[PDB]
């Protein structure tokens with residue numbers, strides 16, 4: 001409550017208000033602004049400048065007197081001239097797209113500026129330039145079943161599924177985030193509180209494709225034990241993923257393989273070592289974190305992250321951490337090996353995808369942040385504002401807000417590092433795939449920062465440099481030939497809708513929500529061309545779930561809808577929605593005349609299941625994502641928002657193996673039909 005404070009909040013990028021649940025402006029408190037400012041950290045040319053290619057590129061200069069300048073391209077090319085302080089000058093025409101370096105010199109000293117030249121648009125594959133309408137499978141990798149996996153779906157299931165998807169006309173397989181989690185705490189299974197967004201989840205390693213597992217005689221002996229084969233059988237046959245058991249199976253197997261691998265002095269060792277070198281420090285600190293984490297839980301299972309570790313292991317420059325790394329070289333190497341194996345197996349999937357000429361092949365998903373106590377915050381502390389957490393404001397459909405427990409990346413550090421952490425984020429998630437889904441793409445404009453320990457309603461939007469981030473996103477998308485899907489559900493200001501579209505970002509449409517206030521559903525053909533349409537997501541009921549009001553009913557049982565008055569409204573809302581959707585299924589040719597017209601009298605059938613998927617398949621959406629859960633007519637969800645211990649999230653497997661579902665007449669017929677819908681959607 002002073003102008004000092006308000007002025008300070010604005011310069012730092014804290015919006016002074018927001019639109020509440022009731023659609024009214026709501027001002028951010030003095031207290032909130034103080035906490036968030038305290039949560040943040042603390043020239044002739046700026047440290048960085050972003051330009052769009054094909055356009056004029058002026059560089060304003062400050063200071064006094066004359067400067068010389070030197071611009072060096074990413075490719076080695078040099079350009080020079082001179083400039084007076086106070087004036088502006090244009091950089092050379094037709095600068096190629098990429099990362100170049102400008103340096104002004106006056107007498108002794110020099111000021112550096114990273115100069116980024118970006119295309120306007122993200123990459124789009126030719127098929128989509130040609131207005132083809134494509135479909136792919138959207139899977140939660142961990143749910144997959146097969147006759148060869150070890151109780152969790154993995155990279156080997158991913159490879160075998162690609163074939164069956166390609167043969168049926170599908171263009172991609174999309175994945176939940178496969179970001180590294182916590183092999184020392186295998187029950188923290190959430191893909192969305194990851195250790196690092198750069199490295200991978202080692203649990204998806206297919207141990208059957210690891211040659212040293214097969215060449216290790218100790219591994220063979222262990223494998224053939226009745227106690228091993230039993231544990232394995234139990235892990236595989238269970239209908240929920242046993243993360244602790246599957247993890248111990250794989251770590252036991254890979255430790256033994258690794259004893260074999262380590263002795264190698266051949267191509268494979270060289271390639272592993274060359275990978276380690278090329279990835280640099282970030283990879284090193286990931287392995288080190290995993291190795292140290294493994295040690296800490298041996299003392300105490302409840303050492304979930306570095307903030308729970310002794311003081312001496314919280315500071316990466318502490319001598320005790322240096323000592324640990326020194327004294328545990330072989331541990332560090334092993335967790336570096338797992339990352340190599342994860343990356344190589346994913347890369348092998350990618351290649352299969354491209355041998356089948358899949359226009360997208362693999363579709364990765366980038367979660368919106370990292371956990372507070374993982375490897376990323378361990379080794380890059382100043383980038384993250386540990387005194388705040390990213391969430392969402394209180395709204396109509398959640399009128400107490402959400403706190404997702406992730407420390408926000410400081411916007412002023414992103415820019416002070418010339419966008420380095422954002423560049424490296426994209427580099428790690430655009431490799432070996434055709435598309436990237438960016439979770440909560442609004443994050444590039446703003447995040448809801450909540451002061452640590454406070455309720456979501458104490459938060460405020462903190463801004464990020466959206467225009468530079470979009471240009472860099474498009475540049476990296478183009479360099480990787482990786483298209484971008486921006487998950488943009490709910491409230492998007494019209495300005496950002498336009499930016500996103502003109503930046504070639506594909507929008508994200510969920511069938512359930514695509515209806516107006518009277519429950520009139522948007523026609524298939526009025527879906528935006530530059531989008532991906534899906535029926536549901538991992539956060540929502542499956543098709544059967546939704547029709548049966550299973551999300552509402554299960555949710556009640558788990559304590560999520562205490563307020564009975566509101567729950568009555570939701571059930572009514574669903575009955576009205578189902579009716580409007582049924583109406584639209586009939587009206588836009590998705591059902592036979594025999595199908596009932598009154599939703600409340602109808603249960604889910606193979607005919608109705610198919611009609612719901614036909615509806616989105618018929619859409620003008622360039623991309624269509626189909627859940628295998630829906631091909632299998634499954635009722636039960638894989639994640640329930642706002643639960644942790646109350647439901648086994650990230651655990652419900654598919655009801656059938658890959659082998660079994662692609663041998664099934666119904667599944668095949670269904671996929672044949674939807675492939676036809678897409679190709680006839682014009």
Ligand SMILES: OC[C@H]1O[C@H](O[C@H]2[C@H](O)[C@@H](O)[C@@H](O)O[C@@H]2CO)[C@H](O)[C@@H](O)[C@@H]1O
Nearest residue numbers: 192193403404439539639640641642643
């Ligand atoms: O990180 C805690 C948070 O994880 C999940 O929420 C995700 C959601 O699954 C994503 O699809 C997207 O909306 O970002 C969310 C924030 O991470 C769980 O669904 C949720 O229960 C939990 O709070």
